[PDB]
Design a protein around this ligand. Structure first.
Ligand SMILES: CCCCCCCCCCCCCCCCCC(=O)OC[C@H](COP(=O)([O-])OCC(O)COP(=O)([O-])OC[C@@H](COC(=O)CCCCCCCCCCCCCCCCC)OC(=O)CCCCCCCCCCCCCCCCC)OC(=O)CCCCCCCCCCCCCCCCC
Ligand SMILES: CCCCCCCCCCCCCCCCCC(=O)OC[C@H](COP(=O)([O-])OCC(O)COP(=O)([O-])OC[C@@H](COC(=O)CCCCCCCCCCCCCCCCC)OC(=O)CCCCCCCCCCCCCCCCC)OC(=O)CCCCCCCCCCCCCCCCC
Ligand SMILES: CCCCCCCCCCCCCCCCCC(=O)OC[C@H](COP(=O)([O-])OCC(O)COP(=O)([O-])OC[C@@H](COC(=O)CCCCCCCCCCCCCCCCC)OC(=O)CCCCCCCCCCCCCCCCC)OC(=O)CCCCCCCCCCCCCCCCC
Ligand SMILES: CCCCCCCCCCCCCCCCCC(=O)OC[C@H](COP(=O)([O-])OCC(O)COP(=O)([O-])OC[C@@H](COC(=O)CCCCCCCCCCCCCCCCC)OC(=O)CCCCCCCCCCCCCCCCC)OC(=O)CCCCCCCCCCCCCCCCC
Ligand SMILES: CCCCCCCCCCCCCCCCCC(=O)OC[C@H](COP(=O)(O)OCCN)OC(=O)CCCCCCCCCCCCCCCCC
Ligand SMILES: CCCCCCCCCCCCCCCCCC(=O)OC[C@H](COP(=O)(O)OCCN)OC(=O)CCCCCCCCCCCCCCCCC
Ligand SMILES: CCCCCCCCCCCCCCCCCC(=O)OC[C@H](COP(=O)(O)OCCN)OC(=O)CCCCCCCCCCCCCCCCC
Ligand SMILES: CCCCCCCCCCCCCCCCCC(=O)OC[C@H](COP(=O)(O)OCCN)OC(=O)CCCCCCCCCCCCCCCCC
Ligand SMILES: Nc1ncnc2c1ncn2[C@@H]1O[C@H](COP(=O)(O)O)[C@@H](O)[C@H]1O
Lengths: 49, 80, 63, 120, 320, 98, 347, 175, 140
């Protein structure tokens, strides 16, 4: 123990860390799903398969 | 809820009567069978002229005279 | 790099950039003609919808 | 300019015809630059709150990068859509108006006379 | 963070905990009035939280490890060199007074933060409303200039207007001869160099300027030296007060919410202590400020924010 | 156009120049904004009642509403000027000149 | 202010701007402007001192006069067109009156006489609301009436705004008056390209709002309202001096920064229309804006003005402020020029 | 000259506007604005708007009573300027009246005039409808349609009046 | 006063010197009235006599600038026999700048206004020659 007062950022806010990692993982999987749907729709509308 | 109601009726009875009358005016037209007849009377009040139709040949619901049996009637307003 | 490589790469660069330059001149001329005449899909400033017009028989006949 | 195009279909970020176009790659250097902007935002965020800039908040830096890549992907889709619309309307207007765009006869330089201006 | 407008919206009203024990009490008096135990005695009768008098190193005691920093990082001043050379060329007198005013502003912010967050009253010693009497004694003794008084009045005019007075102000009548006797019995060799006229000017700005303007906005309790030795009589006089003056009565949830949003932000509390008034006593030049700031960054626990320091043992930094 | 629109637009311009030239008294010009609202009311209402565009007949009422809905605003801003200073003179409001 | 009332009043300011943006009827445009003014007056009087009351009085009088001229333009349009659609105006008199009304609401010169006064009188957050969010509804109406805007009028207003907003900020040491004359010059830049390509008007509006929101967020994060108090920032938080350096060099129109993006594109659209003199004078006159930006960078970042002793206490306390989107806006205001063809999304 | 009755009431309207626009004192400013708003409900009442004239009369009577109370409470001086006390009031009052009756003289002698727009000089009886509206006054039907058709207008107007009360109570606090 | 500049420019250079001088005098007088109106607007003169003195001073200053500009330009176009030539308006702009210096009673303002107003009048003549547009109509 060093600090004379318990700081606001002494421990990581595990709710906020969980929200951050869940939001980031959701945005990556939704981005990759959207891109796969977009390339499949491009290859369907142009017959480039 | 009854003790608070008695308290506000003892202290501010004008406001109790106000919220009671306002609550009735909110909820009670949705619980009346006569609210339909208000609209039916208002749309059966003939301000404009009933502009007639050119008889093409196939209009069985439109009469050729006001005293014909087909057409919209107002017997519901006469009886009520 | 070979002189062949630089030479034919320069020809590819010149094709791409001359096509872009001709398309920019076409783009300026198309913008000028569409603003002047108003018959293209651009510069279509809004007018009134005619679906808003009521064509019912009104109160007085002369309309 | 193109405001009358997007007036029959209002407030569409990406219309249906935008699906007839190739989407940007996930290795698009424009998208990699937007992800680099997300990483720089994470670094400035750790700098202004006096955190260690490279070590603190890797989840927060990663959500900065993820959020900028996610927004920038759709921004690049709408960018590529609007330039494809610009070219489509250009080519259709040139095709529907041949009298305004005559086919030029490019003369060779054996007939083209240019005045020589000597540098002496 | 912990408090904000959303906490105020979701039900945390700060008069739901404002009880009759929530009394901000400031004990005042001359240099050796014997108030130093008295305040603590009040804080062990009324169940209040005692704050010691803000020295140079009060901000050192609130931040970091609580240990006092070296004086070039906090203060750049010395009370003992003020006692030795009051008319010094380096301007230690007003520099010490300005640092003590900033420290008391910080202490009064800590007092109001405790009072508005926990509902426990705070017993202070010489708050910011009584800090000007030492400035005026130093100016009457010619220790400082008139520009120093104008700088202090500008800083006080733009800082004290946002705060409330205490509920109770306790003052201890000790004459100048008894103050000098307690200084001679104290044993501090620097403190024995205090002149009689400086003590007399402290007592004059007390009895002539401080108490006649504080008796309207709070409740004075002026005791002598022998009756301040018995804390039970003082606390008995506190518990039977009729709190009717001052602007604490017309404080709703909204005003105390705005005060609490000001008070918990310490850089907004200390915003106007460093106003750009270039005065030779307090203006530190560019190279010295750069050197002392870069030496302050290299201190343990001071290089980053208060939970982000590997050299003091902060873990899980990559998830914070 | 018709003869009455000359004088209603004339009254708008008279109230415009009365508003836009202050006589060092803020209430005397808050009357001029209310007069501009009156002139806009009568002008729009003459146009709407003339052409029998009946559905815009609710428009001047709405217009008139926002009239007092800013006029009251001005009066709520008149009393703060006349509490800082003993008068509502507009030349007391020159602190933001520096 | 009670935070529920603050939320409702800010949502009502936003509601007034949205009602201007989404409505097809002139009376609803006017209602949106009235609602916007009416709700933003207590944002200006958040502190209840005589300078906020003076600023609110001047703002009420200017915006009320502008709304009178706007409703007169609407009624003359009703006469000469028999309709209420928000589109081009069917009379040059109504066109002039509505252009004057919107120029007063933007604070464009020679109607600029309220923007440094009102911006200095109010806090930095309400000054941010004034200089960013209130520049969205008149720019909507100007975007919607550009087939009827007089060319000479909007170009005179534009270049007069650029010149007066350039010369005004040179004589200033207060940061809010600097940002207000910066506002005047930038609204001149936005409206000069309005009849040539209004996509560049929207581009300049968005880049300006990003840079101005960055600068006001930096001022609020440092709690600085004067030049000489901004000059103490190197002794307290030296990263903030770097951020105001890069943002003020961005606002001057220097490459490779994003504030060079609108200006250049505006020149790129005015030389297409065979106007060479006018964007040249505009570019040269923007050097005045760059000069007082460089004055602020000299006082803040590139040199070290002398600080005080009490700054040593503020070394021991970090910022607990909500610096909302400050790294995002700092990155977007400086490093967005390689993404310059993104402006096509504003078409 | 009775066919010119809306024109004559409009002359009295402009005279009231020159009366309060010269700004003598808000007592007499309220007087002149009551006179103008009371002949303006006679201008617009001769076009068919009997509901829509009585309301601009009544709302402005309440408004000028409030403005009277404030100019007796806040905007009061020891010697209020009646119409003629100041030379700058009387000068622009006479100026507005002479220019108004000048454009009266130029429009009855010539039967056409042009200030920015072009205006006729015939009596404005000429432009009325030669038909009847039946068993409804049409302006009453249009203002009645504020509840059936004007629902969004109701919502934004009632919200603006609600936040007008909230805004005014937030301004007139002082702290 | 769109027609003031038109009736200035609808006259061939070096033909009728009195009407050119009068037209440029009226252009200068309108500019001086605009400057006088804003000057009595934003900065309150101490009396009505002082206000009309400032108005007449600025109006006669700018009208004398316009008169000597048009006179010098048309006399130079007569004696040099080069009507479509910007050096005529360079000399005329320097004459107007010396006029402005003589009205401000100083030599440095005269030389600076000579240089910049001569360059400005030369650019105006070049714009009249090549058809330069400052308020250009939108074409694309
Ligand atoms: C990158 C650029 C942006 C960096 C922002 C943060 C900088 C920072 O804080 O650094 C501190 C940090 C070191 O700090 P520390 O030791 O932790 O503690 C803080 C110190 O105590 C520092 O001490 P202090 O803070 O207590 O006080 C000293 C003070 C010192 O300050 C002063 O003394 C005042 C100023 C001095 C004079 C001015 C000098 C110039 C400063 C401005 C720059 C201008 C040029 C830029 C272009 C023109 C713009 C006008 O401040 C600093 O030293 C702060 C450092 C700032 C340096 C960088 C400035 C960034 C903003 C400006 C450039 C970017 C925007 C514009 C670019 C436009 C296009 C080119 O530096 C780094 O870590 C640098 C980065 C190194 C690793 C980079 C790895 C990159 C990996 C990329 C691949 C992976 C991601 C892939 C993504 C895509 C996936 C698809
Ligand atoms: C549709 C259009 C959407 C546009 C973006 C909307 C969101 C950003 C703007 C709104 C805002 O003010 O956000 C506050 C902002 C935090 O305020 P701050 O002061 O900037 O943050 C400082 C610290 O990072 C605060 O740290 P902390 O201690 O609170 O904890 C970490 C925190 C924890 O937050 C969470 O865990 C959030 C969890 C809930 C997420 C929502 C699900 C429900 O995560 C972050 O702060 C991550 C970085 C946030 C970046 C904000 C900007 C995002 C991109 C904006 C557009 C950039 C366009 C570039 C284009 C370039 C070319 C033109 O972000 C959040 O609270 C969450 C951001 C989520 C981004 C989602 C993006 C995709 C949306 C679809
Ligand atoms: C033909 C008709 C059409 C022409 C074009 C349209 C007309 C407008 C022209 C452009 C604007 C001119 C400037 C107007 C404002 C004047 C400045 C002022 O207020 O001064 C008072 C005051 C100066 O007094 P002060 O500060 O107490 O100090 C004075 C000293 O104590 C004592 O010092 P002092 O004794 O030396 O007196 C000072 C005064 C004395 O200056 C004079 O008496 C000189 C008067 C002009 C001389 C040059 C005339 C040249 C004419 C052209 C050549 C003729 C032939 C042309 C042939 C064809 C072309 C080749 O000098 C100044 O005020 C200097 C600044 C203004 C320079 C104006 C130059 C105009 C050139 C026009 C060329 C055409 O300054 C201010 O208050 C400045 C702040 C004003 C802020 C707002 C300004 C807004 C201006 C808007 C004007 C346009 C409105 C557009 C409406 C439509 C869009 C919404
Ligand atoms: C235009 C004419 C100048 C008007 C403003 C002059 C400055 C204000 C002034 O008169 O203050 C005195 C006076 C009161 O001020 P003060 O406190 O006594 O200050 C003077 C001191 O007493 C000190 O005593 P002083 O009078 O002996 O010293 C003043 C000094 C006298 O100068 C000297 O003592 C030494 C300089 C000798 C003459 C300058 C030689 C310049 C040579 C050409 C430059 C290099 C060109 C290189 C390339 C050549 C080939 C292209 O004159 C100046 O500082 C004026 C400099 C030039 C002003 C225009 C610069 C525009 C730059 C735009 C960007 C490029 O104010 C007035 O009289 C106000 C009214 C001024 C005239 C009304 C406006 C006329 C506008 C006509 C139409 C303009 C159209 C646009 C032209 C410009 C844009 C293209
Ligand atoms: C849902 C239906 C529609 C309701 C909205 C429409 C209302 C129409 C009538 C207009 C009312 C406008 C004015 C209302 C003001 C209410 C707030 C108020 O005045 O609170 C204070 C009052 C006590 O007064 P006090 O604090 O002493 O004030 C100083 C002066 N003595 O506090 C009180 O008196 C207590 C107020 C709360 C308790 C009232 C309980 C009334 C119950 C009546 C029966 C149930 C009716 C149905 C609705 C549900 C009610 C909970
Ligand atoms: C960050 C951008 C987030 C966008 C979310 C979706 C918004 C949306 O649907 O926008 C529709 C609009 C295109 O619709 P449109 O009717 O053409 O509007 C142009 C206005 N003249 O799309 C746009 O206007 C896109 C561009 C908006 C960019 C604003 C911030 C930069
Ligand atoms: C020329 C001339 O007479 O200049 C003198 C004049 C100042 O005259 P003064 O001293 O007031 O009598 O001086 C001025 O008015 C200022 C300078 C007049 C113009 C000088 C032009 C040439 C300067 C050198 C240019 C080098 C390149
Ligand atoms: C730095 C400043 C550089 C300024 C460069 C100005 C270049 C001249 C541009 C204006 C000009 O003179 O254009 C020529 C034009 C006459 O040609 P035209 O367009 O045919 O006019 C007939 C009207 N349809 O003329 C006109 O349209 C009217 C005359 C314009 C005069 C502009 C200058 C006024 C005085 C100086 C301010
Ligand atoms: N503003 C001030 N200026 C100078 N000395 C002070 C100031 N405030 C407190 N002191 C000193 O702090 C000490 C307080 O005495 P004590 O009662 O022992 O706490 C005495 O030495 C005072 O002189």
């Amino acid at each position: 123990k060093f600090y004379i007062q318990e700081p606001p950022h002494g421990s990581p806010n595990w709710l906020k860390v969980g929200l951050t990692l869940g939001t980031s993982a959701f945005l990556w999987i939704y981005l990759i799903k959207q891109h796969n749907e977009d390339v499949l729709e491009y290859k369907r509308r142009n017959g480039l398969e | 809820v009854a003790a608070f109601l008695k308290n506000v009726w003892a202290k501010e009875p004008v406001l109790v009567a106000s919220f009671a009358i306002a609550g009735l005016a909110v909820i009670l037209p949705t619980l009346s069978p006569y609210t339909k007849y208000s609209l039916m009377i208002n749309r059966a009040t003939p301000y404009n002229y009933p502009v007639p139709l050119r008889d093409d040949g196939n209009m069985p619901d439109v009469p050729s005279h006001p005293q014909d049996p087909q057409g919209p009637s107002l017997e519901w307003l006469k009886r009520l | 790099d070979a002189p062949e490589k630089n030479y034919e790469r320069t020809m590819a660069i010149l094709q791409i950039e001359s096509e872009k330059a001709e398309l920019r001149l076409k783009e300026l001329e198309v913008r000028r003609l569409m603003r002047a005449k108003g018959d293209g899909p651009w510069f279509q400033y809004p007018t009134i919808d005619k679906a808003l017009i009521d064509h019912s028989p009104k109160a007085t006949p002369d309309n | 300019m193109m405001t009358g195009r997007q007036a029959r279909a209002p407030l569409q970020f990406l219309p249906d015809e935008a699906r007839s176009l190739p989407p940007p790659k996930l290795t698009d250097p424009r998208l990699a630059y937007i992800g680099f902007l997300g990483y720089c935002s994470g670094l400035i965020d750790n700098a202004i709150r006096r955190r260690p800039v490279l070590s603190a908040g890797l989840h927060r830096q990663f959500l900065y990068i993820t959020s900028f890549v996610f927004v920038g992907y759709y921004l690049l889709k709408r960018q590529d859509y609007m330039y494809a619309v610009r070219d489509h309307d250009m080519f259709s207007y040139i095709k529907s108006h041949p009298e305004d765009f005559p086919e030029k006869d490019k003369k060779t330089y054996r007939e083209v006379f240019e005045e020589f201006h000597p540098v002496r | 963070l912990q408090y904000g407008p959303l906490a105020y919206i979701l039900g945390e009203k700060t008069t739901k905990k404002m009880t009759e024990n929530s009394k901000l009490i400031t004990v005042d008096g001359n240099i050796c009035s014997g108030k130093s135990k008295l305040a603590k005695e009040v804080a062990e009768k009324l169940g209040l939280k005692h704050f010691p008098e803000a020295g140079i190193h009060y901000a050192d005691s609130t931040t970091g490890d609580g240990k006092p920093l070296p004086v070039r990082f906090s203060g750049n001043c010395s009370l003992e060199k003020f006692y030795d050379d009051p008319k010094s060329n380096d301007g230690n007198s007003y520099r010490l007074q300005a640092w003590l005013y900033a420290s008391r502003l910080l202490q009064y912010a800590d007092a109001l933060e405790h009072l508005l967050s926990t509902g426990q009253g705070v017993v202070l010693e010489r708050s910011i409303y009584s800090d000007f009497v030492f400035l005026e004694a130093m100016y009457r003794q010619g220790f400082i200039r008139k520009q120093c008084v104008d700088h202090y009045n500008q800083v006080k005019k733009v800082t004290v207007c946002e705060y409330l007075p205490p509920h109770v102000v306790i003052y201890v009548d000790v004459p100048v001869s008894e103050v000098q006797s307690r200084i001679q019995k104290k044993g501090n060799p620097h403190e024995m160099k205090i002149t009689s006229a400086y003590l007399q000017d402290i007592e004059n700005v007390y009895k002539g300027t401080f108490l006649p303007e504080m008796s309207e906005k709070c409740e004075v309790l002026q005791y002598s030296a022998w009756e301040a030795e018995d804390a039970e009589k003082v606390v008995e006089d506190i518990q039977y007060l009729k709190y009717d003056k001052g602007p604490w009565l017309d404080q709703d949830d909204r005003k105390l919410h705005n005060l609490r949003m000001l008070v918990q932000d310490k850089l907004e509390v200390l915003n106007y202590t460093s106003i750009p008034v270039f005065l030779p006593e307090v203006t530190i030049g560019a190279h010295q400020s750069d050197r002392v700031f870069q030496e302050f960054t290299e201190l343990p626990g001071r290089k980053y924010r208060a939970g982000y320091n590997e050299d003091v043992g902060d873990k899980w930094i990559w998830l914070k | 156009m018709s003869l009455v629109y000359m004088n209603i637009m004339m009254a708008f311009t008279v109230s415009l120049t009365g508003l836009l030239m202050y006589r060092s008294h803020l209430m005397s010009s808050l009357l001029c904004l209310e007069g501009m609202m009156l002139s806009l009311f009568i002008l729009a209402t003459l146009m709407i009642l003339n052409s029998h565009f009946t559905l815009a007949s609710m428009m001047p009422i709405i217009l008139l509403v926002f009239a007092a809905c800013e006029a009251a605003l001005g009066l709520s801003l008149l009393v703060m000027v006349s509490n800082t200073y003993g008068t509502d003179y507009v030349q007391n409001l020159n602190l933001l000149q520096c | 202010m009670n935070p529920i009332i603050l939320i409702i009043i800010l949502m009502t300011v936003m509601l007034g701007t949205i009602i201007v943006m989404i409505s097809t009827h002139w009376l609803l445009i006017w209602i949106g402007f009235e609602m916007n003014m009416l709700a933003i007056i207590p944002i200006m009087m958040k502190k209840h001192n005589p300078r906020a009351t003076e600023a609110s009085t001047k703002y009420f009088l200017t915006q009320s006069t502008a709304s009178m001229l706007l409703m007169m333009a609407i009624i003359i349009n009703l006469m000469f067109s028999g309709q209420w659609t928000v589109m081009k105006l069917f009379n040059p008199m109504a066109s002039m009156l509505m252009t004057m009304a919107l120029a007063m609401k933007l604070g464009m010169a020679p109607f600029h006489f309220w923007v440094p006064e009102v911006t200095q009188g109010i806090p930095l957050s309400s000054g941010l609301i004034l200089l960013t969010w209130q520049k969205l509804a008149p720019m909507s109406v100007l975007y919607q009436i550009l087939p009827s805007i007089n060319l000479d009028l909007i170009l005179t207003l534009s270049i007069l705004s650029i010149t007066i907003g350039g010369w005004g900020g040179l004589n200033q040491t207060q940061l809010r008056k600097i940002m207000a004359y910066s506002s005047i010059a930038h609204m001149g830049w936005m409206t000069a390209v309005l009849l040539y390509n209004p996509t560049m008007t929207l581009l300049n509006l968005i880049i300006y709002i990003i840079m101005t929101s960055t600068m006001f967020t930096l001022f609020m994060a440092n709690s600085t309202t004067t030049t000489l108090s901004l000059s103490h920032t190197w002794n307290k938080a030296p990263i903030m001096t770097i951020l105001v350096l890069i943002t003020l060099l961005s606002m001057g129109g220097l490459p490779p920064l994003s504030g060079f993006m609108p200006k250049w594109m505006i020149i790129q659209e005015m030389t297409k229309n065979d106007s060479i003199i006018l964007p040249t004078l505009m570019a040269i006159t923007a050097l005045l804006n760059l000069y007082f930006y460089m004055r602020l960078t000299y006082s803040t970042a590139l040199t070290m003005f002398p600080s005080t002793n009490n700054m040593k206490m503020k070394w021991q306390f970090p910022t607990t402020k909500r610096m909302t989107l400050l790294p995002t806006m700092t990155v977007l205001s400086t490093m967005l020029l390689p993404l310059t063809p993104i402006l096509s999304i504003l078409e | 000259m009775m066919t010119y009755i809306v024109f004559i009431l409009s002359i009295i309207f402009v005279m009231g506007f020159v009366g309060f626009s010269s700004k003598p004192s808000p007592i007499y400013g309220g007087l002149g604005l009551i006179v103008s708003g009371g002949v303006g409900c006679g201008i617009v009442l001769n076009f068919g708007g009997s509901f829509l004239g009585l309301m601009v009369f009544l709302i402005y009577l309440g408004g000028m009573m409030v403005v009277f109370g404030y100019t007796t409470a806040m905007a009061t001086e020891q010697y209020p300027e009646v119409w003629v006390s100041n030379k700058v009031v009387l000068g622009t009052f006479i100026t507005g009246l002479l220019m108004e009756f000048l454009m009266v003289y130029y429009v009855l002698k010539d039967k056409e005039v042009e200030i920015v727009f072009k205006f006729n000089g015939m009596g404005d009886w000429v432009i009325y409808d030669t038909g009847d509206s039946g068993f409804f006054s049409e302006e009453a039907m249009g203002i009645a349609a504020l509840y059936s058709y004007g629902t969004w207008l109701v919502i934004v107007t009632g919200w603006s009046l609600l936040i007008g009360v909230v805004v005014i109570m937030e301004i007139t606090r002082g702290n | 006063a769109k027609t003031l500049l038109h009736q200035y420019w609808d006259i061939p250079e070096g033909t009728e010197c009195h009407r050119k001088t009068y037209a440029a005098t009226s252009i200068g007088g309108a500019s001086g009235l605009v400057v006088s109106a804003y000057s009595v607007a934003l900065k309150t003169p101490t009396s009505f006599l002082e206000g009309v003195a400032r108005t007449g001073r600025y109006t006669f200053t700018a009208a004398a600038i316009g008169a000597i500009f048009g006179l010098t330009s048309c006399i130079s176009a007569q004696v040099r026999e080069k009507p479509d030539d910007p050096l005529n308006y360079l000399i005329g702009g320097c004459a107007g700048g010396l006029t402005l210096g003589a009205r401000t009673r100083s030599y440095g303002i005269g030389a600076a206004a000579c240089a910049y107003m001569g360059l400005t009048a030369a650019l105006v003549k070049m714009g009249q020659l090549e058809g330069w547009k400052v308020f250009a109509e939108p074409k694309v």
